[PDB]
Amino acid sequence: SNELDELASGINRMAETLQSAQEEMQHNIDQATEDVRQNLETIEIQNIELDLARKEALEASRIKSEFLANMSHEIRTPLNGILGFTNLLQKSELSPRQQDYLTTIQKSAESLLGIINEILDFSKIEAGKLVLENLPFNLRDLIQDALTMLAPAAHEKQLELVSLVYRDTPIQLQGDPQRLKQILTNLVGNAIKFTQGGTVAVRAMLEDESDDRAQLRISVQDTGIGLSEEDQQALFKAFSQADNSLSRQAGGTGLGLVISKRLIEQMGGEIGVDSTPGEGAEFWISLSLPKS
Amino acid sequence: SNELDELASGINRMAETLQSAQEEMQHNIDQATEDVRQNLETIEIQNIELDLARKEALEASRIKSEFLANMSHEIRTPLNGILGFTNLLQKSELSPRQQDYLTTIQKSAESLLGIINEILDFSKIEAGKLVLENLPFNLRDLIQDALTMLAPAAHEKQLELVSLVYRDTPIQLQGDPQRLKQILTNLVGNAIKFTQGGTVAVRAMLEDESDDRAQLRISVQDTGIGLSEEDQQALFKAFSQADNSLSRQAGGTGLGLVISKRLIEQMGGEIGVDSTPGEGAEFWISLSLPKS
Amino acid sequence: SNELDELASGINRMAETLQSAQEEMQHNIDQATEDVRQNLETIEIQNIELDLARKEALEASRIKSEFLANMSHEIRTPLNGILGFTNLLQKSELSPRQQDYLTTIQKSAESLLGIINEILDFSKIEAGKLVLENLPFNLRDLIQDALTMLAPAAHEKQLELVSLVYRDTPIQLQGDPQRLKQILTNLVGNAIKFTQGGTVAVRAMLEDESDDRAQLRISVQDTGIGLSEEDQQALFKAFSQADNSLSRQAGGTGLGLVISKRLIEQMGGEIGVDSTPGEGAEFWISLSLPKS
Amino acid sequence: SNELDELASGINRMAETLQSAQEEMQHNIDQATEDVRQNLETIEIQNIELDLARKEALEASRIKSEFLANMSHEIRTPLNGILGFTNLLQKSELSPRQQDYLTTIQKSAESLLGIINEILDFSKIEAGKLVLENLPFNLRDLIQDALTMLAPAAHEKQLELVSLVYRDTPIQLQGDPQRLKQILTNLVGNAIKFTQGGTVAVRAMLEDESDDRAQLRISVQDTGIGLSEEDQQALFKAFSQADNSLSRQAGGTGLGLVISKRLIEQMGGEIGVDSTPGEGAEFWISLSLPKS
């Protein structure tokens, strides 16, 4: 019976390895109930921290907007007193020299007013409460008026201001002509600061056109003809600093550039800075506007 | 009988049920590899969003601080032109009426200067770059000097400025006497605006005392003696608005109050507003300062 | 997860060891079908040899019985001629010496006749064709009649024949009185040859008793009173030779003793030889017989 | 977690079916240890009965041989007395008629002596103690001498004894001439008893021949010429009875025929009886013997 005891002990050896493998497989089931518990614990712990950080960022944006509006109002009170009493003095008997000093106080106070209006504008954009007007306008007239406003500053630095609206450019549009002019004056004004000589050229071009709307590109370029190597380096450095401030949005190149980006984005457009070594650098805006 | 064929067919019947159970158990293993993958995907997706929101909050605070400093600088340029040319006009031949208009433009511009100095101060506090001085000072002299500077504003509204430092109040302390004076002038200046008549009373009291430090409470109270029911309602309303702005911190009661709260908190102290119907309302600060 | 791939690969590793163990366990099942076949082959091979040896022993016994009966008949034919012509000569004119020679031939032929009658008796016993009579008998009378017929032979050797049936011995029995007398005359006749002097004593004793049957012991003892040491040695040697012939059954102590053992065994009894040095040796029979 | 509890309960349901299948498979292992035990118990029980029956058959043959030798001795004692006293009477003064009666008693006793000598011969053959001699002999002389010894018995019944050894029959052989003569005298002697008239013819023929040995056939035929229908029926009946006794081996046709068959078989030969209605019946022997 040498083979009969082998079958009786072989089945006991086979069943002993199955009880040892089931103890190893039960350890895997006991570890899967703990590993899944730890995962659904961290998904809900991290899910509540994401709701907290999301709520804190929305409150910091609401408070930033309120703070700026309150600061603008705090400055507006004494500024209105300066503007009011300057007008009263301007209507009185003064010498030509005394009137020159008042004209300077008036222009300084009017620029200060423009700054606190940008702070108020930015607080409204930050809150989403900025309403754009809906008025028909002439794009050629708009660019010419913005360039006439900046002609003293351009002639101060020995620069020429050139405007170019092409024949195929649709000029009878509809939107916010004062906010579009605010963007243009800021871009042209910045271009004047960035160059030592040459011409600042504004071009208005058509990109795409339909029966109801018109897609436009407006470029403010400092061509830099006759600029020395030092002035060429200074021009590209100034435009790259403005391109960095456009991405950063911290008011590095002035608050007007921050608002120019937020205004063009509200109109469903884009703003950027282009550059070519033997062509000079430029600002550009791309926007779609309906036709009159 | 025929027991050998029962063992040979019993093992085939047992192995047939294991192949059917392994098909059901393979479906559970194929579902556990997808359910665990979805969990470790969301734990790492949520973990990267928490790192992103943490980095975005730090950048929004750095940009808020830079924006305010740039805004302050932008206003300072035209403001100094107003201040400068107002001084030049004040040195010229003008009538008494013309000189009174200039004095008003000058006072308005000086208040505007104080506001943009606070904006610059707040941008330094917002960046954590505000360093407190370490100078010995006399607390009685400090409060008396702050009240002397606010005496014209208090006498303009027919109010009296009273100071009271008790005998047991330790006056020989050490810290930032200019920042503590900035808090006091703001609190007393706000108290002057909140009342139509009576006295603004400042009291300096000891709360707790040790060999090296002193815990103090300073209260700026509008007692409101002789105020009509309308002026009493207006006083409580003004102080409750200031208490709301203290909690909100959005510059509702002026930027000076926002700085007063941030400065007292930087010194390890507290600030609040107390009120009693037949006693008038007050501002209070609690702070600990070392002696000598 | 790291534990999910362990369950998917653990089931494949567990099933791989079952296919390897089933190959080893299939070798044990293939060996059990051969080891059981060899066992049921030898049980039927040995079972057919037991039927063959049983049939061969029955044929050897049938042939032995036929041979003895034929041997008896073969001798009877010439023996009857010797007996017939001896009688014819005895009825003729002969001298006293010639008549003594015939008397010797006659007695020799009569003893030869007695031998071939025992050979015929034994051939009937050997064939199982011996049917026992069923007659009531008196056991005391039976033993007395057997002893009367052996008194000449006992008195020839100077011996006494004694009989002893106890008071408690049931004498009214039923069976084969002629076959029981044949056993007794042979045992007493042999006892007469085995001793030189004394008495041959027959004792009939009860061993066990019921309402319908009686278990008896009959002993034929040569007491050996007055026997010399030489005659005592010769007596025990003669009885031990008869005890050997009883076990051997080869006719060593005569064919009569072979028939005595077969007859007592057919009656469901036993026969033996007992011995005690200072008591003489004896024959004994044990048998159960019903009562009249 | 609906699929996690399915894997934890599926492994418990799978292991429950394995414990139930192992209980059924353990019952098969517990039955195989009893079924194999019963088989090896009967193989050893039957193996010991085969050793017992084998030993009992060898002892029954040894005892049969001793019994026959003792039977022969038991008959020899009274027979020797008859022979002895018959010779003593034959040497005395008797009439011719008295001498004829003694001659008959003598011939009857001498035949009886021949029978008990055959019983002693058969007991030696039965014990395997019969050694065959190795002597050269003349087969023609052997048959002629056997026929000369049986001529008185043949002439008593008015029969003729004829011998015929062919020219191609090898007569110079080697073996046991006395045992071969014993077979021939018995066969011829039996043939004499089986017929009432005619000739008993012995023929010696060659069957097969080699350089060292010779295969022979010897026939003893009762031709039965001149036999009536009654004597022809009696002849075939006598020879068919002898043919039955040859197969049965019970001594039915005399012990001499039993010895004739055992002797021819010991020499590696055969013996039988042939018959043809119009030719008479015969005995035959076939045997191989070496030459010279």
Ligand SMILES: [Ca+2]
């Ligand atoms: Ca370019």
Ligand SMILES: [Ca+2]
């Ligand atoms: Ca009984």
Ligand SMILES: [Ca+2]
């Ligand atoms: Ca005894």
